[PDB]
Amino acid sequence: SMQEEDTFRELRIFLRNVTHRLAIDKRFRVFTKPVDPDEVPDYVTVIKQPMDLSSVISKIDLHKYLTVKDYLRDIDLICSNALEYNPDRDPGDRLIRHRACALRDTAYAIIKEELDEDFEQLCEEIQESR
Ligand SMILES: O=c1cc(Br)cc[nH]1
Ligand SMILES: O=c1cc(Br)cc[nH]1
Ligand SMILES: [Cl-]
């Protein structure tokens, strides 16, 4: 229905704004771009399911997210991939991991304060109906 297409558009607008807020934060610059296979040839090796904020924006625009839960799964990937790829005690690794965790925490905190639970519940019920 028109009504359900309105709901999914509202969700895309919501997720675009949250993603843009994360992308413009100087802490999260490393996460805004896919990992360059020159720079890092072994990444696209052991990181099976790469994810970055430009990919998240492309997925919004292609209607791949029907719920905030699906979106947060991709945010969780950005964090768990950073944790997996950069596990060393060296400050370089520790800094990426802290920034990855901060990205994840910020996304969850924005959604906690700004997403209406009844809005998410509606998205979930339309998603399940298909
Ligand atoms: O991401 C957003 C931002 C504003 Br302002 C309003 C709705 N969604
Ligand atoms: O199944 C897998 C594949 C890769 Br690549 C890394 C972890 N687990
Ligand atoms: Cl830096």
UniProtKB/Swiss-Prot annotation:
Q: What induces it?
A: Up-regulated in breast, uterus, colon, ovary, and stomach tumors. Induced in breast cancer cells overexpressing NCOA3 or treated with estrogen. Down-regulated in 5-fluorouracil-resistant derivatives of the colon cancer cell line HCT 116.
Its subunit composition reads: Interacts with ESR1 and NCOA3 and these interactions are enhanced by estradiol. Interacts with acetylated lysine residues on histone H1.4, H2A, H2B and H3 (in vitro).
UniProt feature coiled coil, ranges = 108-130
Where the record annotates domain Bromo, the positions are: 3-114
Q: Which domain of life is it from?
A: Eukaryota
* Protein known as: ATPase family AAA domain-containing protein 2
Main role? May be a transcriptional coactivator of the nuclear receptor ESR1 required to induce the expression of a subset of estradiol target genes, such as CCND1, MYC and E2F1. May play a role in the recruitment or occupancy of CREBBP at some ESR1 target gene promoters. May be required for histone hyperacetylation. Involved in the estrogen-induced cell proliferation and cell cycle progression of breast cancer cells.
